[PDB]
Amino acid sequence: DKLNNLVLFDKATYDKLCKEVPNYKLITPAVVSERLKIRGSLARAALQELLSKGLIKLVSKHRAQVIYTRNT
Protein backbone atom coordinates (compact mmCIF):
# COMPACT_ATOMS: atom_id res chain seq x y z
CA ASP A 1 0.00 0.00 0.00
CA LYS A 2 0.96 3.75 -0.20
CA LEU A 3 3.24 4.79 2.76
CA ASN A 4 2.61 8.52 3.61
CA ASN A 5 5.69 9.15 5.89
CA LEU A 6 6.22 12.59 7.59
CA VAL A 7 8.89 14.95 6.02
CA LEU A 8 9.22 17.01 9.31
CA PHE A 9 8.63 16.11 13.02
CA ASP A 10 5.26 16.93 14.72
CA LYS A 11 5.01 17.51 18.54
CA ALA A 12 3.25 14.10 19.11
CA THR A 13 6.17 12.27 17.29
CA TYR A 14 9.02 14.63 18.47
CA ASP A 15 8.36 14.16 22.26
CA LYS A 16 7.88 10.36 21.60
CA LEU A 17 11.37 10.26 19.90
CA CYS A 18 13.24 12.21 22.69
CA LYS A 19 11.67 9.87 25.38
CA GLU A 20 11.56 6.37 23.75
CA VAL A 21 14.30 6.15 20.99
CA PRO A 22 17.15 6.68 23.48
CA ASN A 23 16.55 3.18 24.69
CA TYR A 24 16.21 0.52 21.98
CA LYS A 25 18.39 -2.50 21.56
CA LEU A 26 19.47 -1.44 18.06
CA ILE A 27 19.85 2.07 16.69
CA THR A 28 19.54 2.92 12.94
CA PRO A 29 17.88 5.22 10.41
CA ALA A 30 15.76 2.30 8.96
CA VAL A 31 13.95 0.96 12.13
CA VAL A 32 13.31 4.54 13.52
CA SER A 33 11.76 5.69 10.14
CA GLU A 34 9.64 2.44 9.99
CA ARG A 35 8.37 2.44 13.66
CA LEU A 36 7.60 6.23 14.09
CA LYS A 37 6.38 6.76 10.42
CA ILE A 38 9.28 9.22 9.62
CA ARG A 39 10.99 10.05 6.25
CA GLY A 40 14.48 8.50 5.63
CA SER A 41 16.28 11.93 5.66
CA LEU A 42 14.62 13.28 8.90
CA ALA A 43 15.19 9.90 10.72
CA ARG A 44 18.90 9.98 9.58
CA ALA A 45 19.15 13.67 10.78
CA ALA A 46 17.45 12.85 14.18
CA LEU A 47 20.14 10.21 15.13
CA GLN A 48 22.97 12.72 14.26
CA GLU A 49 21.30 15.36 16.57
CA LEU A 50 20.89 12.75 19.42
CA LEU A 51 24.67 11.91 19.07
CA SER A 52 25.47 15.71 19.38
CA LYS A 53 23.47 15.83 22.71
CA GLY A 54 25.10 12.50 23.79
CA LEU A 55 22.14 10.16 24.64
CA ILE A 56 23.04 7.42 22.03
CA LYS A 57 26.40 5.70 21.07
CA LEU A 58 27.65 5.30 17.43
CA VAL A 59 28.64 1.56 17.10
CA SER A 60 30.03 1.69 13.48
CA LYS A 61 29.68 4.41 10.74
CA HIS A 62 29.40 3.49 6.99
CA ARG A 63 27.74 4.80 3.73
CA ALA A 64 25.04 2.04 3.58
CA GLN A 65 24.40 1.18 7.30
CA VAL A 66 24.97 3.51 10.37
CA ILE A 67 24.31 1.44 13.59
CA TYR A 68 23.36 3.25 16.90
CA THR A 69 22.58 1.81 20.42
CA ARG A 70 21.43 2.87 23.97
CA ASN A 71 24.17 3.36 26.67
CA THR A 72 24.36 1.29 29.95
Partner: protein, 140 residues
Protein backbone atom coordinates in the same frame (compact mmCIF):
# COMPACT_ATOMS: atom_id res chain seq x y z
CA UNK B 1 14.60 18.49 12.58
CA UNK B 2 12.57 21.34 14.27
CA UNK B 3 8.70 21.47 13.96
CA UNK B 4 7.59 23.80 11.09
CA UNK B 5 5.29 26.67 12.32
CA UNK B 6 3.73 27.58 8.87
CA UNK B 7 4.57 24.66 6.47
CA UNK B 8 3.04 25.68 3.06
CA UNK B 9 1.91 22.10 2.12
CA UNK B 10 0.99 23.00 -1.55
CA UNK B 11 2.74 25.84 -3.54
CA UNK B 12 0.81 27.54 -6.43
CA UNK B 13 3.60 28.95 -8.76
CA UNK B 14 3.46 29.40 -12.62
CA UNK B 15 -0.03 27.70 -12.80
CA UNK B 16 1.66 24.53 -11.28
CA UNK B 17 0.96 22.54 -8.03
CA UNK B 18 4.44 22.23 -6.31
CA UNK B 19 4.65 19.66 -3.42
CA UNK B 20 6.57 21.34 -0.50
CA UNK B 21 7.41 17.83 0.93
CA UNK B 22 10.13 17.17 -1.77
CA UNK B 23 13.46 19.13 -1.37
CA UNK B 24 13.35 22.59 -3.13
CA UNK B 25 16.09 21.81 -5.78
CA UNK B 26 14.07 18.76 -7.09
CA UNK B 27 10.65 20.20 -5.91
CA UNK B 28 10.64 22.84 -8.76
CA UNK B 29 11.45 20.17 -11.49
CA UNK B 30 7.63 19.48 -11.46
CA UNK B 31 7.39 22.78 -13.50
CA UNK B 32 7.57 21.89 -17.27
CA UNK B 33 10.58 23.63 -18.95
CA UNK B 34 12.69 23.14 -15.72
CA UNK B 35 14.93 20.02 -15.24
CA UNK B 36 17.29 18.79 -12.45
CA UNK B 37 20.15 21.03 -13.88
CA UNK B 38 18.39 24.42 -14.58
CA UNK B 39 16.57 24.21 -11.17
CA UNK B 40 19.98 23.76 -9.37
CA UNK B 41 21.71 26.79 -11.09
CA UNK B 42 18.53 29.00 -10.62
CA UNK B 43 18.59 28.34 -6.80
CA UNK B 44 22.44 28.69 -6.55
CA UNK B 45 22.23 32.05 -8.49
CA UNK B 46 19.59 33.26 -5.91
CA UNK B 47 22.04 32.00 -3.14
CA UNK B 48 19.19 30.04 -1.36
CA UNK B 49 20.23 27.05 0.88
CA UNK B 50 19.24 23.93 -1.21
CA UNK B 51 19.07 21.89 2.11
CA UNK B 52 15.73 23.71 2.95
CA UNK B 53 12.49 21.78 2.10
CA UNK B 54 10.19 23.54 -0.50
CA UNK B 55 7.39 23.83 2.17
CA UNK B 56 9.46 26.10 4.54
CA UNK B 57 10.36 28.89 1.97
CA UNK B 58 9.21 32.50 2.80
CA UNK B 59 7.06 34.65 0.39
CA UNK B 60 10.02 36.91 -0.74
CA UNK B 61 12.27 33.80 -1.39
CA UNK B 62 9.69 31.99 -3.66
CA UNK B 63 8.90 35.41 -5.34
CA UNK B 64 12.70 35.84 -6.02
CA UNK B 65 12.84 32.21 -7.41
CA UNK B 66 9.85 33.06 -9.75
CA UNK B 67 11.32 36.43 -11.01
CA UNK B 68 14.87 34.88 -11.56
CA UNK B 69 13.20 31.88 -13.38
CA UNK B 70 11.26 34.28 -15.74
CA UNK B 71 14.18 36.59 -16.82
CA UNK B 72 17.45 34.55 -16.52
CA UNK B 73 19.65 36.91 -18.70
CA UNK B 74 19.48 39.75 -16.05
CA UNK B 75 20.93 37.39 -13.32
CA UNK B 76 24.03 36.21 -15.36
CA UNK B 77 22.75 32.68 -16.32
CA UNK B 78 24.87 31.70 -19.40
CA UNK B 79 23.52 31.64 -23.04
CA UNK B 80 24.11 27.83 -23.46
CA UNK B 81 21.50 26.88 -20.72
CA UNK B 82 18.45 28.68 -22.30
CA UNK B 83 15.71 26.29 -23.64
CA UNK B 84 15.01 28.76 -26.54
CA UNK B 85 18.41 30.12 -27.80
CA UNK B 86 17.61 31.51 -31.34
CA UNK B 87 13.77 31.91 -31.68
CA UNK B 88 12.82 31.44 -35.42
CA UNK B 89 10.71 34.69 -35.47
CA UNK B 90 12.29 37.41 -33.20
CA UNK B 91 15.75 35.73 -32.66
CA UNK B 92 16.30 36.30 -28.88
CA UNK B 93 17.40 34.07 -25.91
CA UNK B 94 14.65 33.07 -23.37
CA UNK B 95 13.65 30.19 -20.99
CA UNK B 96 10.05 29.00 -21.81
CA UNK B 97 7.98 27.59 -18.84
CA UNK B 98 4.94 25.18 -18.81
CA UNK B 99 2.15 27.05 -20.76
CA UNK B 100 4.83 28.85 -22.91
CA UNK B 101 6.64 25.57 -23.85
CA UNK B 102 3.31 23.84 -24.81
CA UNK B 103 2.23 26.96 -26.85
CA UNK B 104 5.74 27.26 -28.48
CA UNK B 105 5.77 23.47 -29.33
CA UNK B 106 2.26 23.46 -31.01
CA UNK B 107 3.27 26.76 -32.80
CA UNK B 108 6.60 25.20 -34.04
CA UNK B 109 4.67 22.02 -35.15
CA UNK B 110 2.05 24.28 -36.91
CA UNK B 111 4.92 26.30 -38.60
CA UNK B 112 6.48 23.00 -39.95
CA UNK B 113 3.03 21.62 -41.06
CA UNK B 114 2.26 25.00 -42.83
CA UNK B 115 5.29 24.78 -45.26
CA UNK B 116 4.81 20.97 -45.95
CA UNK B 117 8.34 20.03 -44.66
CA UNK B 118 9.02 16.22 -44.36
CA UNK B 119 9.26 16.50 -40.49
CA UNK B 120 5.82 18.27 -40.52
CA UNK B 121 4.22 15.47 -42.67
CA UNK B 122 5.90 12.74 -40.48
CA UNK B 123 4.50 14.63 -37.39
CA UNK B 124 0.96 15.05 -38.94
CA UNK B 125 0.78 11.23 -39.70
CA UNK B 126 2.01 10.37 -36.12
CA UNK B 127 5.31 8.63 -37.14
CA UNK B 128 9.01 8.92 -36.02
CA UNK B 129 10.77 12.17 -37.21
CA UNK B 130 14.43 11.30 -36.22
CA UNK B 131 14.81 8.61 -38.98
CA UNK B 132 14.51 5.38 -36.91
CA UNK B 133 13.33 2.08 -38.52
CA UNK B 134 9.63 1.88 -38.01
CA UNK B 135 9.15 -1.71 -38.93
CA UNK B 136 10.19 -4.02 -36.26
CA UNK B 137 9.54 -1.74 -33.38
CA UNK B 138 7.53 1.20 -32.30
CA UNK B 139 4.13 -0.46 -32.19
CA UNK B 140 0.72 1.20 -31.33
Amino acid sequence: LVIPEKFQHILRVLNTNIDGRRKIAFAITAIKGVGRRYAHVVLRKADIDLTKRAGELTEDEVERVITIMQNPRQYKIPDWFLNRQKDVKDGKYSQVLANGLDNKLREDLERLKKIRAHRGLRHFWGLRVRGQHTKTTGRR
